[PDB]
């Protein structure tokens, strides 16, 4: 069996090809102690990673090696990969071929360096680097559709027709779950709650995951939340203190539809999705509109598929159906589709093998992978 | 062997004397001390040695003497002391040069073993002679290098910072059964 | 140390002593340096007069690239006839020194800096000729491609500065390119050196250091050096290329850039050594972790109470 | 083995590492005669120390060399340390390492002169200075908690999470059992009884140690004592005359909860503990609330743990379990935890050694004991 | 004539539009007596404000109704505004429109209560609530700049280009002169000086602003202080006791560059200034680097402009001039800027008039002010 990893910008999803769900899902985080250990014989470690960094976060500064789908810290990424292999899956990396995964329109250096580290540091037998949105069609059982994938670091559109991608119509938006956590920390300040530290950011991420939703019509929802407390909810901090939340409960996710809330000049997720369909050839658009696939954690908000169908129906011509397939497992659909792909008998000649890498160098990945 | 001048390092308990064969003095004479700190890890790069370590106690570095009572007892600190001796002060490439090292007559088999692996695997020197230290001090006693001025029989009393040892040498041979050591010296 | 000094530290400290000293003693001191370089420092006729002489296997190549002109410009009236077995020499008279401690200090620095001054002439030849090509290309931008193509062969410097390194460099109207045809012959340094040379080139692809010279690497040679005599494409050399652009040798920055590029392979060699001391501390930390897994096989027994010297104690 | 010397403000507590309790426990006092020494011979001395001063006190001026945790008189502190080693433990200090202690936020010079006298007067082979509240946490069997330690001269709060101290959240309060003794002298004067001398200050310290206690609700206890004989009880002086007291039994300890009774402008020990928890990072607060550790003789009052729990429960949010850990041995927890620490094998590498002091001078303590 | 009142966390600055300095500068403090008022007559009051509280402080518990730029005590803040209008400016607030100020990223309730109190209790005819660092740019005479403002409670960076603020690039740090004063109380304890009453905090505040300075290279000044007497200076307490102080003169202000000195996870003021420029659009950064405007009392240290210029030159690319702009009057520049804005002939349409408050209520302020 192959390994498959979505090295996501916020969570690692790792496991074996042919299994139904990731074996290991954990924070894509390394934490380091900020205070001095006064107590002798304690289990003091130089750094912590994943769920152990998340558990100990009150004494750690927390860093993510991936920002916007780009590996910005290679040492902390190597710590995360070492943790995936030896601690989480607890298999030696030399034994199984590994399907890694990436966002489209990344730096070419990100994929080469990821390839060089797997073959020369972890000594893997073979590996591949798939596009996250292509895997989301494999999980959905499609060969035609436009995938809106939105994780922690990047949002992207990939249109595919009958197994052919249209790489000129691919869209990237460096706005996803982390930018919505940053913005929820900022708009929590105006109700008087201060979240500042790297650990308080993880509490605000949990507030966003538990309470936020997408409002089907933002100005009617803003008028509703100004009229009564009925839209308000409460969250209890690890301190046992309670915070109450109101219009900032849906004004946070609206940054996906209104990127100007975080000050960036770009189209919202509905307009980048429509612009991706309108960059495609005219005969395929009619089938892309019926096959909008949603994937990744930032597509998990209550009401987002209803908002997304409403907005795409207003942009598209009214003479044809808009359908959006946002399945309940879509949080793991990139990994599920990678497990399907790495399990196909017709895929087993598509791996980059170690013997084929060390006659070509890490640029082999640009001609074996999309 | 290479035609480059051998490098001489007498690492004493108090002082290290560093230089090249055939000079009229050591190039450096400074304390056998290391100043060490007490998101990439670099605290093993941050150390200092010798006169430049004495300047660092006010900057919060812990000073230590890796040689005490004549014997090396901290091989982390002695490896860092030698790399800084070779690459800062002597400013030399070990692959081009043969080295003369020293230690007391008593010194453990373990110390010469640990010395050889640091010299041949860490630094990769071309070759190493670990000398019997006060036997060299007999040869420094000559009035000149010419064979007619040599006195190959004599007792040598060596007393440095850490240990004093009395060595009988006759016709150039060390009478090892007759070595005496007193564990008391300049410190 | 994270970075190597550019100057010979012994010559700097010795001259800083003797330029201050009330009563100079004689000296006779051969002193090694990196890249097979050697100095002789001595008082050959009076304790009052110090002769400093440099021996360097590539000095005949360096003279072809304008080295004597630069050494006469730097050392001036102190230049002396070469000593036997040495390529260059300078005589400093301790009664003839500058009138200030700061002029004395920068003279002691200038004489300690002599290995990087003899080796700087091909870089100054490239920087000054790039300024001619820059002015001609500013005159006619459509003639510039032919000036760069001819300067890539007619204005190329190669220095075989040690038997396992060739530094090759040339001007073009907007740059100086320098290629280190580079090797480690010691097998553990060749193995660690592959990691150092790989991570060196990948560092330049990250956002934080885009301000640096462009770097490229291979292990065949860069196209414009493939037919330089003594470059060889199968002979275990890697080829580190630096493209210095006009911003890397601006007048505020030329001498630091020259000093810092010459020490490239010396910092890499030094850090390949210092990495072993790091690996050894990484190892013995987890020897101390494995101790705790064996200590759980020791059955628990109270030891008798002992004083600091280990003598038995009779209380409690 | 090593000596552990908890040289506190009011009692010296001393013994050996690995012993169940201190085997030397005596007043931190030097006494000197205040009267005409008329009989020649008679076994007279120039000064007296500890229990010898406490038993002769009717003819002695008594003074403590240590006040508010700071050595004010080094000549008498050497006299006390000599009494610990040669009279009370009966040891050569040159044969034994010594673990010393002090309160946090002390003058730097206190640590320096304390290391200097240990190496240069007592010729010790090795020594260390521990923070008293960090020692008290080992005696709890805990590696996280907030320790409220109150001795004779100082009260302090130190929060520790998983062996990391949070030094910004450490609180000191220069109010403890000597301030409560002085206040008991001031209020005993209102019922008819004047205690004035340094010898009479030891009688009223003994009254405080067995008559006084903490009320669960001060205004109800104050009203119950104002309207009944039931809170009143008595004590017999050395002179055989009897003292009766009532609300003085709980008014004295209430100064820990209401420092304004002695003219101080500070939070009480309950609110100072809460302010220390609230200075810590938000994720650690839950485990600090569940681990409030009491220490030192000023925590030995009846009812103080029940009061401390009542008061912190009103300050913290009701959504979590406040727990106060008040062992019956908390009279000695700093010493107990020093005997744990001094017996651990990593601690054998943490000592300042004689050779290392001789090379560095007394400043070595600031760069080795934290 | 309009009034301008800059509600600082530590000082009120107040006066009239078109004047070149504030008429009233006084402590943002209310004091109440904490001792027995035994003497009838003799001019006593139940409470004291500003300079009266500062002069009588030995007998008072002082407190500030502002914490980190937020009003935490509204009844005391009414007493400060009443003192400002009736005692210190000597005006009827019903006759003059008032320009007020606050920090960015404040609670919306702060601005609502501040507009409500001003109309509904002071009967002000019209009022406005400006961002403090937007006013500091008016005083500097500029349309573009990044303003570092640091007062008593907050440090904030707001970048402005051609009169447009970048609200997403605004940085806030709840660390300024109160936190530096409390950290100086902390580290004065290690020299042996105890300052603990809120009146003693005002003595340490005065030690801070007469003796402290910013070290251009901190680790070299630490080495210089460890090896010299020349660093040390002396201060006269109100008692006529003389304290002497050394490395604590530059360790206190270095907390702005190293917030971990007080246990904060935040980046230093140089890093937050650079992070704020790097959140701006790439075309405006050149003019922000050349216009780093400094304001507020925590920017008044000797050598702070030089350390700020050194540190931002180490973050930025070397090809453009970093200019720190540090006016000699920069301690008042927010108030100077309010005097300009309230005097501008274009501003009189921007006031909230009581006629707007009478129909909209206090929520009017969020749509009239930035
Ligand atoms: N239920 C949810 N509702 C809203 N946001 C979510 C939800 N679950 C996860 N997220 C966001 O999505 C991120 C993880 O999604 P994922 O698809 O795994 O991203 P990635 O692949 O980049 O790691 C989280 O860190 C959080 O920002
Ligand atoms: N003039 C002197 N008189 C006495 N002792 C001296 C004198 N000069 C140096 N020393 C002492 O000699 C010792 C150093 O001698 P050295 O031979 O260098 O020792 P080592 O080799 O063991 O390090 C030190 O204790 C030093 O203080
Ligand atoms: N049972 C008790 N009840 C009240 N106070 C007590 C009790 N036992 C001791 N104390 C007081 O505690 C103080 C001594 O406590 P200790 O922890 O030994 O202080 P220290 O370490 O600072 O010397 C004295 O003020 C003493 O009177
Ligand atoms: N010269 C100075 N040097 C250092 N700190 C100062 C100086 N003058 C005032 N401060 C500090 O700055 C603050 C007062 O400045 P100010 O700008 O008026 O703050 P605010 O507006 O927020 O009240 C106080 O915390 C004070 O301690
Ligand atoms: Mg993903
Ligand atoms: Mg010796
Ligand atoms: Mg005590
Ligand atoms: Mg202010």
UniProtKB/Swiss-Prot annotation, chains A, D, E:
Residues recorded as bearing Methionine (R)-sulfoxide in the entry: 39, 42
Keyword Phosphoprotein assigned: no
Alphabetical GO biological process terms: actin filament bundle assembly; actin filament polymerization; mesenchyme migration; positive regulation of gene expression; skeletal muscle fiber development; skeletal muscle thin filament assembly
Keyword Metal-binding in record: no
Highest taxon of source: Eukaryota
Modified residues (Tele-methylhistidine): 68
Enzyme class: hydrolase
InterPro entries assigned: Actin, Actin/actin-like_CS, Actin_CS, ATPase_NBD
Residue(s) carrying N6-malonyllysine: 56
Modified residues (ADP-ribosylarginine): 172
TM helices/strands, residue ranges: none
N6-methyllysine modifications at: 79
Location(s), subcellular: Cytoplasm, Cytoskeleton
Keyword field: Acetylation, ADP-ribosylation, ATP-binding, Cytoplasm, Cytoskeleton, Hydrolase, Methylation, Muscle protein, Nucleotide-binding, Oxidation
SUPFAM superfamilies associated with the record: Actin-like ATPase domain (SSF53067)
UniProt signal peptide: none
Region ranges (Interaction with alpha-actinin): 105-118, 353-365
Catalytic activity: ATP + H2O = ADP + phosphate + H(+)
GO cellular component: actin filament; actin filament bundle; cell body; cytoplasm; filamentous actin; filopodium; lamellipodium; skeletal muscle myofibril
SMART domains the UniProt entry points to: ACTIN (SM00268)
Post-translational modification: Oxidation of Met-39 and Met-42 by MICALs (MICAL1, MICAL2 or MICAL3) to form methionine sulfoxide promotes actin filament depolymerization. MICAL1 and MICAL2 produce the (R)-S-oxide form. The (R)-S-oxide form is reverted by MSRB1 and MSRB2, which promotes actin repolymerization.
The enzyme's E.C. designation: 3.6.4.-
Miscellaneous comment as given in the Swiss-Prot or TrEMBL entry: In vertebrates 3 main groups of actin isoforms, alpha, beta and gamma have been identified. The alpha actins are found in muscle tissues and are a major constituent of the contractile apparatus. The beta and gamma actins coexist in most cell types as components of the cytoskeleton and as mediators of internal cell motility.
Entry similarity comment: Belongs to the actin family.
Function summary: Actins are highly conserved proteins that are involved in various types of cell motility and are ubiquitously expressed in all eukaryotic cells.
Protein name listed in UniProt: Actin, alpha skeletal muscle
Originating organism: Oryctolagus cuniculus (Rabbit)
Swiss-Prot record, chain B:
Domain of life of the organism encoding this protein: Eukaryota
Annotated compartments: Cytoplasm, Cytoskeleton, Actin patch
Quaternary assembly: Component of the Arp2/3 complex composed of arp2, act2, arc1/p41-ARC, arc2/p34-ARC, arc3/p21-ARC, arc4/p20-ARC and arc5/p16-ARC.
Family according to the record: Belongs to the actin family. ARP3 subfamily.
Function: Functions as ATP-binding component of the Arp2/3 complex which is involved in regulation of actin polymerization and together with an activating nucleation-promoting factor (NPF) mediates the formation of branched actin networks. Seems to contact the pointed end of the daughter actin filament. May be involved in cytokinesis.
Protein name: Actin-related protein 3
Source organism of the structure: Schizosaccharomyces pombe (strain 972 / ATCC 24843) (Fission yeast)
Gene from which this protein is expressed: act2
Swiss-Prot record, chain C:
Sequence similarity: Belongs to the ARPC2 family.
Annotated SUPFAM superfamilies: Arp2/3 complex subunits
Subunit composition and interactions: Component of the Arp2/3 complex composed of arp2, act2, arc1/p41-ARC, arc2/p34-ARC, arc3/p21-ARC, arc4/p20-ARC and arc5/p16-ARC.
Lineage: Eukaryota, Fungi, Dikarya, Ascomycota, Taphrinomycotina
Keyword Cytoplasm: yes
Full protein name: Actin-related protein 2/3 complex subunit 2
Cellular component GO terms held in the UniProt record: actin cortical patch; Arp2/3 protein complex; cell division site; cell tip; cytosol; nucleus
Pfam families assigned: P34-Arc
Keywords from the named record: Actin-binding, Cytoplasm, Cytoskeleton
Known function: Functions as actin-binding component of the Arp2/3 complex which is involved in regulation of actin polymerization and together with an activating nucleation-promoting factor (NPF) mediates the formation of branched actin networks. Seems to contact the mother actin filament.
